[PDB]
Amino acid sequence: EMMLDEDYKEGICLIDFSQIALSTALVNFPDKEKINLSMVRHLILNSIKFNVKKAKTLGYTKIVLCIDNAKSGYWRRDFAYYYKKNRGKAREESTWDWEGYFESSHKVIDELKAYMPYIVMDIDKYEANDHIAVLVKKFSLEGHKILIISSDGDFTQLHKYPNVKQWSPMHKKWVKIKSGSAEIDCMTKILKGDKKDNVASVKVRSDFWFTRVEGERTPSMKTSIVEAIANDREQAKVLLTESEYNRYKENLVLIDFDYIPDNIASNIVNYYNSYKLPPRGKIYSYFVKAGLSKLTNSINEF
């Protein structure tokens, strides 16, 4: 029986929220139109209502909204300047109002922190995946069951942790965390790169994807090397050259959640622990102030 067991260490839901909101915005807001504060506030609140309802029915009552905040870049890019620069380039050339979207979304995130009953993990230069990785490690060790709500995020690196599930709202399905190939899949990114984030192979210079000249290519790497190092990372010093090994060390920081620097992880945990949760009364007053007359009818749903 459910009643006879809603756990003393309560279930925690971490929502990969910026990606859900942005995906929805790219569908709902057309190109060549100014994206304003009210548009974004409505979208964010509607998305929260849908996804919190989901967590709650699945039995995970503590909600943490994990936010991508790249207003001033990325801590990883302070390490590897080229990290994710391909993403910025693409947004520059778009006719969608990225500037208005981001400006409005930052304002709304601040309203959530002031008024809504969720822990909003938002720190400039920190990624939603950083909050999820660090908090899953923390909460899983403390004995909490965890639900990650993320449409397309790959959280298979978290395969070692007990009682972690992932639900994809976009695809309406459960997503494997214990995939059976998590270490190999992680190592493939470390060794061969992850082009979508401008991470290059260990067989080329660190900033290859950002500085590539015409005709340049990535030398291939044998799958067997990837599998060998995935199985025993000490093999990196045996199967890689010195130059490749130095690149492997760089790529570990860019890819592997276990290589989030101590200060970054400590900052995330400290921000969580000190978080000032708004009194539940502030929801109604926020909805009135923002003129959300339809949502005032749905307070209990938040």
Side-chain angles (χ1 to χ4, degrees):
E1 166 74 60
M2 310 305 207
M3 302 194 283
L4 218 155
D5 209 332
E6 160 187 358
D7 283 313
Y8 183 61
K9 301 302 185 57
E10 70 165 317
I12 298 173
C13 180
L14 299 157
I15 305 186
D16 189 5
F17 182 71
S18 296
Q19 287 281 75
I20 289 173
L22 174 60
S23 287
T24 299
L26 288 164
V27 171
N28 292 8
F29 301 159
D31 280 349
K32 308 199 151 199
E33 162 175 291
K34 189 193 132 221
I35 293 171
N36 67 49
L37 181 54
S38 181
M39 288 168 63
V40 172
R41 187 184 292 117
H42 274 102
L43 183 150
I44 282 173
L45 290 168
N46 294 338
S47 183
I48 288 174
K49 187 168 87 282
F50 177 82
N51 287 292
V52 167
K53 166 189 181 181
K54 190 67 197 193
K56 284 154 143 53
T57 65
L58 294 169
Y60 298 82
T61 45
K62 171 64 149 216
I63 311 298
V64 182
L65 303 181
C66 295
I67 306 304
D68 289 310
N69 187 339
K71 178 167 189 61
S72 307
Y74 303 89
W75 62 262
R76 281 177 173 98
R77 170 189 283 186
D78 295 354
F79 168 57
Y81 81 94
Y82 54 82
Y83 177 77
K84 289 188 175 182
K85 287 280 267 198
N86 60 133
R87 305 198 170 253
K89 184 100 247 60
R91 286 161 181 173
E92 298 176 26
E93 310 151 7
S94 177
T95 170
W96 196 75
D97 188 18
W98 287 98
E99 183 185 47
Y101 180 75
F102 288 130
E103 179 188 332
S104 299
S105 74
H106 291 294
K107 293 186 198 169
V108 175
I109 297 315
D110 288 345
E111 293 175 353
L112 305 178
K113 292 180 182 187
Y115 309 122
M116 299 294 285
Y118 318 116
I119 302 295
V120 177
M121 298 297 297
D122 163 67
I123 305 175
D124 189 4
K125 306 181 70 154
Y126 294 54
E127 310 188 52
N129 285 3
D130 297 336
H131 302 305
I132 293 166
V134 171
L135 296 174
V136 164
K137 177 174 190 181
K138 170 178 161 61
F139 296 148
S140 73
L141 304 178
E142 297 170 347
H144 299 268
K145 300 192 163 58
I146 300 152
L147 175 66
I148 300 168
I149 294 178
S150 176
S151 288
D152 290 285
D154 178 359
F155 291 106
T156 60
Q157 285 187 53
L158 300 177
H159 71 107
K160 54 190 163 214
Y161 296 107
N163 290 121
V164 180
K165 292 177 177 190
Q166 176 180 348
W167 174 256
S168 168
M170 189 186 305
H171 310 308
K172 305 187 174 284
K173 67 189 185 182
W174 294 106
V175 178
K176 277 276 85 178
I177 297 286
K178 288 172 195 287
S179 75
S181 62
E183 293 298 329
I184 292 171
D185 290 343
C186 179
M187 190 55 58
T188 294
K189 292 167 191 291
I190 294 160
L191 295 174
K192 295 194 175 182
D194 192 9
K195 179 175 186 193
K196 62 175 178 283
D197 293 341
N198 257 14
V199 179
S201 167
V202 302
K203 296 184 86 91
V204 302
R205 67 191 178 272
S206 312
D207 61 357
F208 181 85
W209 287 123
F210 188 68
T211 62
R212 210 186 140 259
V213 304
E214 304 173 280
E216 280 189 315
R217 287 306 183 270
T218 300
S220 55
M221 184 188 271
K222 285 288 194 174
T223 294
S224 70
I225 291 184
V226 178
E227 287 177 355
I229 297 177
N231 292 348
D232 179 2
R233 291 185 177 198
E234 279 266 72
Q235 285 297 263
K237 297 184 205 205
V238 180
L239 297 179
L240 302 181
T241 65
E242 186 163 9
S243 167
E244 291 164 352
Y245 176 78
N246 290 328
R247 289 281 296 103
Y248 163 83
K249 294 195 291 184
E250 292 170 14
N251 283 187
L252 279 172
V253 182
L254 299 177
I255 303 297
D256 188 324
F257 295 157
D258 289 316
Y259 283 74
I260 294 168
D262 299 324
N263 72 307
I264 297 300
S266 294
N267 288 340
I268 291 165
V269 171
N270 293 161
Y271 178 98
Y272 180 84
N273 287 339
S274 73
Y275 191 88
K276 181 208 297 306
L277 193 64
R280 259 196 84 86
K282 299 259 189 83
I283 307 165
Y284 174 78
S285 68
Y286 170 43
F287 285 6
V288 170
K289 172 158 184 166
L292 305 169
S293 63
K294 295 165 174 52
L295 291 186
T296 287
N297 291 328
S298 294
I299 304 278
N300 71 307
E301 290 175 58
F302 285 91

